[PDB]
Amino acid sequence: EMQLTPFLILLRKTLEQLQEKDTGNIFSEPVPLSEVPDYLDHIKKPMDFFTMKQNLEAYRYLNFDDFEEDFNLIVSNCLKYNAKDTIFYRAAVRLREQGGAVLRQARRQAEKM
Ligand SMILES: CCn1c(=O)c(=O)[nH]c2cc(C(=O)N[C@H](c3cccc(F)c3)c3nccn3C)ccc21
Q: Is the distance from CB of 49 to CB of 74 less than 8 angstroms?
């Protein structure tokens, strides 16, 4: 129960804050199926920050939980696909950790609305 415009402004800011934690920009765009041809065999719902931005502007995030769930998919897809001894896997762990405080603070701002 709140106004749409300030909520979307908050989500845009939050998405930027999350992307700032991905310094190598490895989560910025869809995993390229031309370089990773078997990716969809194991990952049923790919996600990345560009797709999240598209979803945001298409009004697909009208609650904080749905936004946070797509962020969690970026992380969990990467943990699932990649071996534990890779930079990718460790980057997903780090993103999960650093994203946590970002999301907790942003959710508090949504609740304030
Ligand atoms: C973390 C999400 N992620 C995975 O989780 C995963 O398993 N494989 C991934 C593979 C790529 C990937 O191929 N990057 C290349 C690349 C290499 C160097 C710079 C640059 F900008 C892009 C590339 N893109 C298109 C063509 N080329 C070669 C990206 C993410 C991936």
A: yes
Rg (CA), the chain: 14
DSSP characters over 36-81: STTHHHH-SS---HHHHHHHHHTT---SHHHHHHHHHHHHHHHHHH
Ligand 1 contact via 88 beta carbon (within 6 Å): yes
Ligand 1 atom with least separation from CA of 88: 1
Ligand 1 binding pocket includes 11 (Cβ within 6 Å): no
Number of domains in the chain: 1
- CATH number of the domain bearing residue 21: 1.20.920.10
